[PDB]
């Protein structure tokens, strides 16, 4: 009955704000008017990226942003609401540049959540900003708080929530309540910084936006798909860092939740969230990329997949060699490692040597240039079907993507998602998800339905025996056990009843 969310990030730089225009694709490639009325129906939210946090621990614009020009750009967005019953113009604070451990503004994020006084100051400053420009909510895309600074981050979220609720009340917005989201890590290494406190992080949120992409890059030893749905046994595996999180669980409970090594996939990140108690599927949103990640130096043999590579990982890109054959955006934006789906469809469609291939295990596409040893991992309307099925099957809240300004001018990626959830003509029940590797981890938040003979006191239970008791199914870790299930360390809760 309820609609899957469709959360589209929207980026525009400070300099394109201050020289903003609707008619010069040289000064502004993707201006607001680019977003049709029919497109504005297709999105539930639009995250206007990015604001930041200045030395005073307040939410702010880039010091050299011009207010009037900044203001005009937002009303144009908020205007879109006329076309859509449900649209929210969120604003997003953070991004990688501002908030990474060695980003420009990093310390501000640390100090803004460090104390009650600061959290008060900062949270007020978020809402103050939200109303003062017409925004329908707040997104916090801090990549990422670390253990000591997670508690404060939590508190910050709680504070903002309360202030959003006060404002929802004040403006009589029960029809469309001011919302709070974050962009969350989509991979175990980064997710392990706050994993143990995930239920508290999610509680004050309408959604957690899983950045289930950028899971491969130049930093890796080996080329890999950046947003594989399921795992390919030919591909690389990784250490499950979540088995070392401060959870206080037993060896069995850890082993059962965190297989290691494992495949770094979308399914993996989602199940990892589901495994925690108090994290409802409905709040979990699957990110997907509207860009492609490009590698060079790939030895052939297997489509450029899982190969050693010569892609620099420095920031910024350290030279003037734009090797990504026939990507103008890469020249103008000065980085060949990232390309929009717009620019990718060109590259392929053109006369270029690129070969679009398909991995039937990961259900993702990838471009292979055999002449120049190039490999590109990305998503398209074809992979989006399998990701759309998963969202349904697993009963997630919907989809997020980065970003809208990297879809084409028609907007067929956006339209393809909207189709897979909504459009009544569309169907995907026969769609084969394949024999890709699933994350099989089980935790206390995603216990499978099971049955077993009822436990009987006085009975001696061997290693492995299963019984039913007080609503749950239990399993003996060793034998022979006579204690009541749950009363000592010999029992493992493996499933639930009825």
Ligand X SMILES: C#CCO[C@@H]1[C@@H](C)[C@H](OC(=O)NCCCCNC(=N)NC(=O)NC)[C@@H](C)C(=O)O[C@H](CC)[C@@](C)(O)[C@@H]2OC(C)(C)O[C@H]([C@@H]2C)[C@H](C)C[C@@]1(C)O
What does the binding site for ligand X look like in residue numbers (CB under 6 A)? 9, 11, 13, 50, 95-97, 100-102, 141, 183, 187, 189, 211, 214-215, 217, 219-220, 238, 291, 313, 316, 333-335, 338, 402
Annotated binding residue 96 = yes
> Which of 179, 213, 472 has the alpha carbon at shortest distance from 341?
213
Planar angle of CA 114, 117, 123, nearest 5 degrees? 85
Q: Which long-range CB contacts under 8 A does 486-493 form with residues at least 24 apart?
A: 489/250, 492/252, 492/253, 492/256, 493/444, 493/447
How far is it, in rounded angstroms, from Cα 128 to Cα 119? 14
CB of 139 to ligand X, least distance (A): 8
Nearer to ligand X, 29 or 303 (CB): 29
Token pair listed for 139: 């997104």
**143 belongs to the catalytic site:** yes
Contact predicate 275/444, CB 8 Å: yes
Nearer to ligand X, 11 or 483 (CB): 11
Nearer to ligand X, 217 or 280 (CB): 217
Nearer to ligand X, 258 or 491 (CB): 258
CB of 423 to ligand X, least distance (A): 26
Annotated binding residue 142 = no
Annotated binding residue 219 = no
CB of 87 to ligand X, least distance (A): 18
Annotated binding residue 212 = yes
Q: Which residues, in sequence order, are CB contacts of 424 under 8 Å at separation 6+?
A: none
Candidate list 58, 143, 149, 329, residue with the active-site label: 143
Q: How many CB atoms lie within 10 A of CB 355?
A: 13
Nearer to ligand X, 252 or 328 (CB): 328
50, 102, 220, 275, 321 from 314: Cα distances, Å: 23, 13, 12, 35, 14
Q: How many CB atoms lie within 10 A of CB 219?
A: 7
Nearer to ligand X, 209 or 468 (CB): 209
How far is it, in rounded angstroms, from Cα 397 to Cα 6? 9
> Which of 18, 130, 6 has the alpha carbon at shortest distance from 73?
18
CB of 322 to ligand X, least distance (A): 12
Nearer to ligand X, 160 or 442 (CB): 160
Annotated binding residue 400 = no
Contact predicate 191/242, CB 8 Å: yes
3-state SS track over 83-102: HCCCCEEEEEEECHHHHCCC
CB of 326 to ligand X, least distance (A): 18
CB of 268 to ligand X, least distance (A): 11
Contact predicate 89/7, CB 8 Å: no
CB of 275 to ligand X, least distance (A): 19
Contact predicate 200/175, CB 8 Å: no
How far is it, in rounded angstroms, from Cα 74 to Cα 81? 12
Annotated binding residue 211 = yes
Planar angle of CA 106, 111, 117, nearest 5 degrees? 150
Known binding-site positions: 67-68, 94-97, 144, 211-214, 402
Known binding-site positions for chitin: 67-68, 94-97, 144, 211-214, 402
Catalytic residues: 143
């Amino acid at each position: 009955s309820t609609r899957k969310a469709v959360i589209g990030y929207y980026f525009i730089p400070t300099n394109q704000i201050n020289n903003y225009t609707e008619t010069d694709t040289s000064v502004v490639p993707f201006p607001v008017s680019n977003i049709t009325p029919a497109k504005a129906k297709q999105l539930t939210h639009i995250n206007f990226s990015f604001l930041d946090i200045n030395s005073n621990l307040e939410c702010a614009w880039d010091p050299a942003t011009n207010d009037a020009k900044a203001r005009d750009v937002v009303n144009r967005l908020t205007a879109l609401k006329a076309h859509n019953p449900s649209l929210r113009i969120m604003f997003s604070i953070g991004g990688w540049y501002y908030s990474n451990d060695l980003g420009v503004s990093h310390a501000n994020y640390v100090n803004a959540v460090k104390t009650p006084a600061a959290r008060t100051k900062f949270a007020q400053s978020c809402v103050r900003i939200m109303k003062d420009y017409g925004f329908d909510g707040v997104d916090i895309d801090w990549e990422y708080p670390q253990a000591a600074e997670v508690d404060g981050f939590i508190a910050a979220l709680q504070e903002i929530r309360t202030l959003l609720n006060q404002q929802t009340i004040a403006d009589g917005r029960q029809a469309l309540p001011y919302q709070l989201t974050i962009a969350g890590a989509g991979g175990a290494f980064f997710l392990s910084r706050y994993y143990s406190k995930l239920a508290q992080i999610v509680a004050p949120l309408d959604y957690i936006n899983l950045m289930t992409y950028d899971l491969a890059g130049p930093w890796e030893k080996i080329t890999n798909h950046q947003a594989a749905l399921f795992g390919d046994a030919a591909g690389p595996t990784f250490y499950n860092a979540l088995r070392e999180a401060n959870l206080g669980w037993s060896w069995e409970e850890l082993t059962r939740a965190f297989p290691s090594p494992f495949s770094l996939t979308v399914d993996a990140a989602v199940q990892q969230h589901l495994m925690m108690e108090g994290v409802p599927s409905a709040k979990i949103v699957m990110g997907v990329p509207f860009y492609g990640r490009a590698f060079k130096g790939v030895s052939g043999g297997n489509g450029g997949q899982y190969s050693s590579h010569s892609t620099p990982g420095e920031d910024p890109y350290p030279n003037a060699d734009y090797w990504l054959v026939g990507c103008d955006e890469c020249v103008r934006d000065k980085d060949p490692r990232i390309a929009s789906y717009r620019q990718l469809e060109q590259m392929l469609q053109g006369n270029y040597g690129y070969q679009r291939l398909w991995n039937d295990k990961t259900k993702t596409p990838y471009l292979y240039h055999a002449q120049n040893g190039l490999f590109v991992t990305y998503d398209d309307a074809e992979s989006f079907k399998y990701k759309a099925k998963y969202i349904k099957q697993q009963q997630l809240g919907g989809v997020m993507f980065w970003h809208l300004g990297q879809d084409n001018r028609n907007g067929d990626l956006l339209a393809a998602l909207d189709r897979y959830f909504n459009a009544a003509d569309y169907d995907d029940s026969q769609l084969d998800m394949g024999t890709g590797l699933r994350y099989t981890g089980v935790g206390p938040g995603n216990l499978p339905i099971m049955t077993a003979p009822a436990y009987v006191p006085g009975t001696t239970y061997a290693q492995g025996a299963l019984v039913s008791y007080q609503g749950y199914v239990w399993q003996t870790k060793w034998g022979y056990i006579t204690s009541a299930p749950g009363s000592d360390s010999a029992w493992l809760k493996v499933g639930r009843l009825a």
